Amino acid sequence: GSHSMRYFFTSVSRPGRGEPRFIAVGYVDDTQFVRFDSDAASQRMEPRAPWIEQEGPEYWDQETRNVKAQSQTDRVDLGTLRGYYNQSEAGSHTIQIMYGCDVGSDGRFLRGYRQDAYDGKDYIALNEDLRSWTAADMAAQITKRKWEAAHEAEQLRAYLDGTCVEWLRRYLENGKETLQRTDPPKTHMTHHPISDHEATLRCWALGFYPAEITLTWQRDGEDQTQDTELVETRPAGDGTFQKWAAVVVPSGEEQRYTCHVQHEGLPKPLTLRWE
Amino acid sequence: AGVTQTPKFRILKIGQSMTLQCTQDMNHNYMYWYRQDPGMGLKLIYYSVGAGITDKGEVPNGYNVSRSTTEDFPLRLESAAPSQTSVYFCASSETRGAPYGYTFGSGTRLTVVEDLNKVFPPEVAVFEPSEAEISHTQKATLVCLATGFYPDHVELSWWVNGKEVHSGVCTDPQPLKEQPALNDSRYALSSRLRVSATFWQDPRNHFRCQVQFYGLSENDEWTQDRAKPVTQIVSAEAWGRAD
Amino acid sequence: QEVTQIPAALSVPEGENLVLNCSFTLRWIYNLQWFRQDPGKGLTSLLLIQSSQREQTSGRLNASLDKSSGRSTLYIAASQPGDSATYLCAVNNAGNMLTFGGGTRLMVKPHIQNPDPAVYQLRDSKSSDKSVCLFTDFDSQTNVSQDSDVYITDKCVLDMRSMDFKSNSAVAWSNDFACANAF
């Protein structure tokens, strides 16, 4: 399948409590492999997946320096953006950064992306062409002019289609036993009468990898997208994922409804019916 | 103004405390402290990315910093060690990338000594041109020789009839060690001023070799017989003659 | 991730074009800088090459940047004795910040068209006792090296604002020693 490497950064100002909270996390697909936390004792980039452990001291020294540099940049940016929006010193504010690259099953570049946020809203985003920026407001428009002058776009693009995709390939090889595996979902169905004339039918998918999956309810053949309760794909905590979809069904008409399960790990798509 | 760094020099006994001040009024978030040993590059000691934070550089050990304000980034030496003999450079920048480059201070030469008794001003003598030289070349080379000074921080200049000269001047690249093996060796420095036979063979011409020495301050304590080896100018002078 | 300058010292006869070498292992550099440092003095910025630039030129100074191979070369055209100084290569990136090479001590030797090597004895202006030996008028190709009772200096560097009586010299003195053999 296709794969992604993503870094997520959360910076939160703590007015009258000293330094802002800084949390950096690296993902290959939905697996966290590195962490930096300002409040942690180490003050190092730390491993969070077994396959990153085989990187030498130079890797950990370099990622520590560079994550600290991003921390320091965020510290400055919190001050500057507070200035741009003319906000008081007493209020807590959040900067969020996500950037990453996607490769196909052949390991080749598909796309790169970066989005920056202030207080849970779009601030500035790299455009699809990886050559220009979209600024959310006049504050971000000041940031855009600075990033244009610094040639930020050209340097970010070179990283996204160079270093990002190169190190994604390395990680995918080193951790292939987990990262490039496919575990099919173990499936079952539950039945919960809500009244004497209605019942919930819940379709379960457990222990599947990767996270991408399609749970679809159909009555007689017709898709029930509009009338399907669909929870977020959640982590089990053992390296696998879980999901369910539910339909409220008139009692004695359960046999009509069918749950379709599409997943990379399946030989053929599954079709499930109630007891 | 740019970056103002004080003091420009300091002699300090082992185990004594000193604060190097560094100030900029450019509202720069980034400020840096470097040290440079003889014939080496600058090495980052400490840096600050804004008011309220400091972070260790390459060689932070034996040093302390603080950044309560945007303006000031002072460097503290709690217990002066021999290894802290170096030249210190403070710097600032508007951004990390510093597209206009870092703004550097003028530098601080610190010498750390076993005791202030190891500090000596230069003795200075001017040697008159050789008659053999004059009659062979029609040129007259004066030699100035500064001896027995420590530390090796002097500025030698030639003054002809009250005005500093550069034409015909040739100074040793660096002071020489009187005792190469020793760490605390006093230094010697020589310089030449070469003029026409005419200019030397004239009693109206006045030649002064001026050696600026950077030594102890006035608030330094001294309990030895010889004169307190304070920052001063020591001079020797020669006069031309036709007879 | 550091900066290196080989050679550490370069001796060049004046008028001759020369090169000073810089190599760095720093990645995603913001810029590379060449500094001049005179003895006892601070830094003078000669050239600052941005990440997006291949070279910078200032008079007789030209500096190239190859980010890929991690190299910069400083070209000094028609070298003058006034070029004599320590040249520091500095590279700036996010993780390491402005990082300095060890430097190259450039000695640009003055051309001596009419060598006249000789050893003269000079007497002190005040006392009849103290004397000095002067070795002078030797060509810039010949060199002088250093008994702990007799002191011999290096061949001096010209005052880089000199316009007359320019020639090489070394000085020797002691506490009875003769000048004829001194060198």
């Binding site: 560079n66 940016d77 500035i124 940031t143 970010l156 190190w167 | - | 913001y30």
Partner: peptide, 9 residues
Amino acid sequence: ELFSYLIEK
């Protein structure tokens, strides 16, 4: 590996 061409906003 992290992106490291850091420009302030």
